[PDB]
């Protein structure tokens, strides 16, 4: 699993070389599909290894959602040091996996035949994507996960081909996805940055290390005000849905890879849900909503001490500014996250985030987040032109 493009340049991709994606070496100057839309689709599911079977997961079934939560909590993405693992909650998963237009067949599980134990998963959700000068109906692929005991058995290519088949059956032939590894071929590369909010706990769990400053000097450095500074800041409410939709749509036009959300999708992704998604709007002295900030909740199991309290992290989502300076908006995001008990605030260097990351004392993380398109060949772009945030 290559983490850098220099490592990835030296190897071959037995599976990805078969797929409609550009080659790693390619410099792309065209815009469009790699292969034509298929007018006949394989009706039979792809063959799994002996003793495993497909199962679409009904997440409205509490027991099935618990199985998925358990698979991901024990087998999903870990940091490069293998010390923390994402701890997606069942309520979070419902938010991420049942947006408007979700389909049950796109919650694609793999189970042991004899015991029915869940050992693999991959998901698709529909999304309208603007990529340069084209708007296309696509799916977002997420939560690809194979049980640790089943790894390195080429189950992941089967999962990918099967979700591809099931998306094709619905008349969709492009996809977007992100990964921490380098594959053919990233459309953009972003880097995660982190902002300490509770430096004491971060040092204790070895998320960060006391850089030479004292513990006292470190806490003073990362101290934040107790209340936000921006006039009119308040939680998003139902009446704000149309103006949030309007603010987001114009703001995203300046980037080259963005979602195109309906008003119902805006409600789903931004309406606040405790311990899932927070959105705050700025309502000025005229009563006009002019800006908003948002971040979602994703804690992480502390792997070496898995008994203890998990690391509570906020992730920057979409932040739109038309009257409040973005620097001030994000400073209030930090203060609000601190108030709500988050230990760290994470953001990527996409969109306009580089304008505030250093100033607000974010530190650069290890490892990249690669963005990919399936069956769409287009030039790559810098991080500041990526305007798409997945969960």
């Amino acid at each position: 699993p290559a983490k850098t493009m220099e490592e990835a340049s030296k190897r071959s991709y037995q599976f990805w070389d078969t797929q409609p994606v550009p080659k790693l070496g390619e410099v792309v100057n065209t815009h469009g599909p790699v292969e034509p839309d298929k007018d006949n689709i394989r009706q039979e599911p792809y063959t799994l290894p002996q003793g495993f079977t497909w199962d679409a997961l009904d997440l409205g079934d509490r027991g099935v959602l618990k199985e998925l939560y358990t698979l991901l909590n024990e087998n999903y993405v870990e940091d490069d040091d293998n010390m923390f693992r994402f701890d997606y909650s069942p309520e979070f998963l419902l938010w991420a996996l049942r947006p408007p237009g979700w389909l049950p067949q796109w919650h694609c599980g793999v189970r042991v035949v004899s015991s029915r134990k869940l050992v693999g998963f991959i998901s698709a959700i529909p999304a309208n994507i603007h990529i340069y000068d084209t708007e296309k109906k696509m799916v977002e692929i997420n939560f690809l996960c194979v049980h640790k005991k089943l790894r390195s058995k080429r189950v992941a290519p089967v999962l990918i081909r099967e979700i591809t088949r099931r998306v094709h059956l619905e008349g969709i032939f492009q996809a977007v996805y992100t990964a921490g590894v380098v594959l053919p071929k990233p459309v953009g590369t972003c880097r995660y940055w982190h902002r300490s909010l509770n430096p004491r706990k971060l040092i204790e769990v070895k998320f960060s290390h006391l850089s030479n400053m004292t513990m006292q000097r470190t806490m003073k450095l990362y101290r934040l005000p107790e209340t936000p500074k921006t006039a009119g800041l308040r939680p998003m409410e139902t009446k704000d849905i149309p103006v949030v939709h309007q603010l987001l749509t114009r703001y995203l036009k300046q980037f080259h890879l963005t979602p195109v959300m309906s008003q119902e999708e805006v409600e789903h992704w931004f309406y606040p849900q405790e311990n899932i998604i927070d959105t705050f709007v700025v309502e000025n002295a005229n009563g006009e909503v002019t800006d908003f900030l948002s971040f979602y909740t994703l804690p992480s199991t502390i792997m070496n001490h898995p008994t203890h309290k998990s690391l509570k992290a906020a992730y920057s989502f979409y932040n739109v500014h038309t009257q409040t300076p973005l620097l001030d908006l994000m400073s209030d995001a930090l203060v609000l996250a601190k108030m709500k008990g988050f230990d760290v605030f994470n953001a990527l260097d996409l969109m306009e985030n580089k304008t505030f990351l250093e100033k607000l004392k974010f530190g650069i993380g290890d490892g990249n987040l690669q963005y990919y398109l399936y069956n769409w060949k287009c030039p790559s772009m810098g991080a500041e032109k990526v305007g798409l945030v997945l969960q």
């Binding site: 490069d80 923390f84 921490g180 993380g365 987040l369 945030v389």
Partner: peptide
């Protein structure tokens, strides 16, 4: 987003 980073 599906990459776990830290400083």
């Amino acid at each position: 987003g599906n990459c776990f980073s830290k400083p």
